[PDB]
């Protein structure tokens, strides 16, 4: 759903992005976080994953810059060293809690992927474990090769994202939909521009066919850039121009915000692209903010390195990077507060 | 298209809709205008069609309310009683001239329609006859019955509109795309809401796949209402709420304006729906204006009736209705100037 139900979804979306805030994605599966851990010599125990999250969530002052945190499902069952549920660290700070609800990717046609997990999504939305969650996330990933992303893969993934979106909303959760364009490929920036415009517009088609409440959806999107294996160079301004044009061409006025993923880009580049895009002229209604994992927490991992002695310095790096991303979400990174 | 080419398209779009202005559609084919003529006893001669248009275009002061006029192709070859090309009447007033470029509709599947004319559209855009035109229009029509509009018909028409759009733009013309939802059918307002959201979102998909410059496209859309053969009642406020929600859900920030078609609705209702929609709250970047034929000119035809003695009163009705539509495009119809 009724009017009040819809207004709640809208309000939650706006509360997450208030005052130049963005999202800390901490939702990595054990496998994804494990690979980052192993590179740095940190063993992939549940204990180390729990401690990492606690390090993140207990950072003093983070709520000034972070409007929501995306949790992995295992993290909802976990407590701090002090016995306090990790979700309580975020509730006391007034930060919105989110749950990543996709169950990963499986192969689709030749060389491509779809995301999976819809068949019990409604059930999982109602779980008592996620009672404090007010938003969710679900990721699809688009590989780029010649002739790919195929139109079938775009349609299928967009349809999955949209079905996820409506199920979340009927359960009182604001969905973040993440149609990630995978950086690791060989493709020009021009091609990325064009395909981003195919994906984002088709996504909005599917959201609309499912009668999703658009003011209650957040879009988690890749910057428009060339692929890592390309020898094409770009700058923050060109990324800002191309990404903003793609978004003005495809995202309706009713969407409350776009939250960029860092995607394998520098922390530095992900934040500078955000600032640059927020300096661009071009009337729009949605906020342009962030939903970073790597851009926000790579520095924490590198500083911490499984050594508790390094934790404070790790938290200070998170707070400093969070500040920069928040300034950048308002186009003020060049300006002194 | 280059940067300058695109900025021209954008500027033209904005010039048409400046200061609460809208579009006078005068583009009816001989067959469409003939049927309106016959109802009122006026013979369907070329001379009478020429005189009607002259009556419209020579109305004193119309340029205050009308930013562009859509002409039928035959009208580009026609002169006033005084020997002045009819297009010069509009050029001297500073009104933008447009050309309707579709060649009508043919049958599609069972009970539905597609619009036609793409195969020589590029050629026709370059014709010397349309040299003074700076915009164009192309209409598709969506019949409603059970199970219809079909997804095939939505895709095909949206694809035709988008191909038209890019051809126009490559020729320096701002395209108006008109995905009309036909009023004459039996369907609820709720169903019209849902299908409008299917059509508008799919349209934006196709515009994006064709890499159309979105700030240089105008959308000519039906109000969301129940069908004429329905016994469902609505009011201006409900139409405003439903139509605005459909548009916020589907139309990107980059579109410069939506221009409503009157569609068989009252002149009174078409203008009151416009005013109502412009009184609604909900952040948006595009103007909400009009591209009326019937709502603006039915009164002229009824007053004139093929009798030159009635012409001045006919022109005064056009100027008065134009004023009302302009006030309504700014949400000021209740307010005294």
DSSP string computed for A256-312? -EEEE--TTS-HHHHHHHHHHHHHS----SSEEEEEESHHHHHHHHHHHTT-GGGHH
Q: Whole-angstrom Cα distance, residue A305 to residue A254?
A: 43
Structure tokens at B240: 């405003």
Q: What are phi and psi of A46, to 5 degrees?
A: -55, -40
Residue among A154, A170, A253 nearest A211 (CA) = A170
Burial of A307 (0-12, 13-18, 19+ CB in 10 A): exposed
Structure tokens at B194: 């849902």
Structure tokens at B246: 């459909």
Structure tokens at A171: 């359960």
What letters, b where the CB count within 10 A reaches 16 and e where it falls short, cover B96-134?
Answer: bbbbbbbbeeeebeeebbbbeebeebeebbeeeebebbb
Count of C-beta atoms within a 10 Å radius of residue A146? 6
Q: Whole-angstrom Cα distance, residue A59 to residue A24?
A: 12
What letters, b where the CB count within 10 A reaches 16 and e where it falls short, cover B83-94?
Answer: eeebbebbeebe
Largest CA distance in chain A: 53
Under a CB-based contact definition with an 8 Å cutoff, are residues A136 and A173 in contact? yes
Q: Whole-angstrom Cα distance, residue B242 to residue B311?
A: 38
For helices B46-57 and B311-329, angle between their N-to-C axes, nearest 10 degrees:
50
Q: Provide the shortest C-alpha distance from residue A287 to chain B (in Å).
A: 12
Q: Whole-angstrom Cα distance, residue B60 to residue B68?
A: 15
Q: Whole-angstrom Cα distance, residue A161 to residue A141?
A: 11
Query: Token match 């199920």: residue?
Result: A167
Determine the distance from the C-alpha atom of residue B297 to the mean position of all C-alpha atoms in its chain, rounded to a whole number. 13
Beta bridge partner(s), residue A258: A219, A288
Q: Whole-angstrom Cα distance, residue B53 to residue B44?
A: 13
Under a CB-based contact definition with an 8 Å cutoff, are residues B289 and B271 in contact? no
Burial of B312 (0-12, 13-18, 19+ CB in 10 A): middle
What letters, b where the CB count within 10 A reaches 16 and e where it falls short, cover B49-67?
Answer: bbbbbbbbbbbeebbebbb
Q: What are phi and psi of A107, to 5 degrees?
A: -65, 145
Q: Whole-angstrom Cα distance, residue B175 to residue A179?
A: 30
Nearest chain B residue to A283, by CA:
B285
Q: Whole-angstrom Cα distance, residue B293 to residue B26?
A: 6
Chain B residues with CB within 8 Å of chain A CB = 194, 197-198, 200-202, 204-205, 207-209, 211, 214-215, 245, 247-254, 282-286
* Number of separate helices (H) and strands (E) present in chain A: 11, 10
Burial of A337 (0-12, 13-18, 19+ CB in 10 A): exposed
Say if the Cβ atoms of A252 and B250 lie within 8 Å.
yes
Q: Whole-angstrom Cα distance, residue B159 to residue B153?
A: 10
Structure tokens at A90: 């975020």
Structure tokens at A319: 């707070």
Catalytic annotation, pick one of B178, B180, B324, B330: B178
What letters, b where the CB count within 10 A reaches 16 and e where it falls short, cover B221-236?
Answer: bbbbbbbeebeeebeb
Say if the Cβ atoms of B282 and A197 lie within 8 Å.
no
Resolution in A: 2.4
Q: Whole-angstrom Cα distance, residue A103 to residue A139?
A: 9
Nearest chain B residue to A202, by CA:
B205
Radius of gyration of chain A (CA): 19
Residue B331 Ramachandran class (φ > 0 left, ψ -120 to 50 alpha, else beta): left
Q: Whole-angstrom Cα distance, residue B263 to residue B294?
A: 8
Residue B282 Ramachandran class (φ > 0 left, ψ -120 to 50 alpha, else beta): left
Known catalytic membership, residue B28: no
Residue among A77, A100, A93, A94 nearest A25 (CA) = A100
What Å distances lie between residue A181 and A35, A72, A189, A197, CA to CA?
Answer: 21, 22, 12, 11
**B186: number of CA atoms within 13 Å, CB side?**
5
Q: Whole-angstrom Cα distance, residue B295 to residue B178?
A: 16
Q: Which of A197, A211, A285 sits opposite B284 (nearest CB)?
A: A285
Q: How are beta strands A174-181 and A218-221 bridged, if at all? A: parallel
Under a CB-based contact definition with an 8 Å cutoff, are residues A315 and A300 in contact? yes
3-state SS assignment for residue B258? strand
Under a CB-based contact definition with an 8 Å cutoff, are residues B96 and B67 in contact? yes
The class of domain B1-337 in CATH terms is alpha beta
Q: Whole-angstrom Cα distance, residue A27 to residue A52?
A: 12
Question: Testing the interface with B: which of A195, A201, A242, A282 to mutate, by most B Cβ within 10 A?
Answer: A201
Burial of B258 (0-12, 13-18, 19+ CB in 10 A): buried
Query: Token match 């002061």: residue?
Result: B61
Radius of gyration of chain B (CA): 19
Q: How are beta strands B22-26 and B66-71 bridged, if at all? A: parallel
For helices B30-39 and B294-304, angle between their N-to-C axes, nearest 10 degrees:
50
Beta bridge partner(s), residue B175: B136
- Reported as type and span, the H/E element at residue B40 is none
Q: Whole-angstrom Cα distance, residue A238 to residue A260?
A: 16
Q: Whole-angstrom Cα distance, residue A180 to residue A190?
A: 17
Q: Which residues contact B197 (CB under 8 A, 6 or more apart)?
A: A208, A209, A211, B246, B249, B250
Say if the Cβ atoms of A205 and B208 lie within 8 Å.
no
Q: How are beta strands B174-181 and A174-181 bridged, if at all? A: unpaired
What Å distances lie between residue B164 and A92, A103, A183, B71, B177, CA to CA?
Answer: 56, 42, 34, 17, 8
Say if the Cβ atoms of A252 and B254 lie within 8 Å.
no
Secondary structure E strands in B51-184: 66-71, 96-100, 105-108, 112-115, 135-142, 174-181
Q: Whole-angstrom Cα distance, residue A25 to residue A20?
A: 16
Q: Whole-angstrom Cα distance, residue A122 to residue A163?
A: 11
Q: Whole-angstrom Cα distance, residue A103 to residue A140?
A: 10
- Reported as type and span, the H/E element at residue A254 is none
Q: How are beta strands A112-115 and B135-142 bridged, if at all? A: unpaired
Beta bridge partner(s), residue A137: A100, A176
Q: What are phi and psi of B336, to 5 degrees?
A: -80, 130
Q: Provide the shortest C-alpha distance from residue A96 to chain B (in Å).
A: 24
Burial of A231 (0-12, 13-18, 19+ CB in 10 A): exposed
């Amino acid at each position: 759903m009724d009017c009040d139900h819809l207004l709640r979804l809208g309000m939650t979306a706006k509360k997450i992005l208030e005052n130049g805030k963005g999202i800390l994605a901490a939702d990595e599966t054990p496998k994804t976080l494990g690979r980052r851990f192993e590179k740095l010599g940190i063993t992939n125990t549940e204990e180390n994953r729990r401690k990492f999250r606690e390090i993140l969530f207990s950072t003093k002052g983070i709520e000034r810059y972070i409007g929501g945190v995306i949790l992995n499902q295992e993290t909802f069952e976990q407590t701090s060293g002090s016995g306090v549920p990790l979700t309580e660290l975020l509730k006391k700070k007034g930060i919105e809690i989110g749950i990543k609800l996709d169950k990963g990717l499986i192969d689709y046609k030749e060389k491509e992927k779809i995301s999976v997990g819809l068949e019990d999504l409604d059930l999982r939305c109602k779980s008592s474990a996620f009672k404090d969650a007010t938003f969710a996330k679900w990721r699809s990933l688009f590989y780029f090769y010649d002739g790919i992303p195929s139109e079938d893969c775009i349609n299928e993934n967009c349809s999955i994202l949209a079905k996820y979106a409506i199920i979340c909303q009927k359960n009182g959760l604001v969905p973040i939909v993440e149609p990630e364009v995978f950086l690791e490929g060989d493709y020009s920036m021009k091609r990325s521009y064009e395909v981003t415009r195919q994906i984002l517009s088709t996504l909005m088609k599917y959201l609309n066919y499912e009668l999703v409440y658009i003011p209650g959806v957040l879009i988690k999107a890749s910057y428009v850039t060339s692929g890592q294996l390309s020898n094409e160079k770009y700058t923050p301004k060109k990324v800002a121009t191309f990404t903003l044009r793609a978004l003005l061409s495809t995202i309706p006025c009713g969407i409350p915000g776009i939250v960029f993923l860092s995607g394998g880009h520098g922390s530095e580049d992900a934040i500078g692209f955000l600032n640059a895009i927020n300096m661009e002229r071009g009337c729009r209604t949605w906020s342009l903010s962030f939903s970073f994992a790597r851009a926000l927490t790579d520095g924490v991992l590198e500083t911490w390195r499984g050594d508790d002695s390094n934790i404070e310095e790790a938290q200070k790096i998170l707070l400093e990077t969070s500040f920069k991303a928040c300034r950048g979400a308002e186009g003020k990174l060049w300006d002194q507060e």
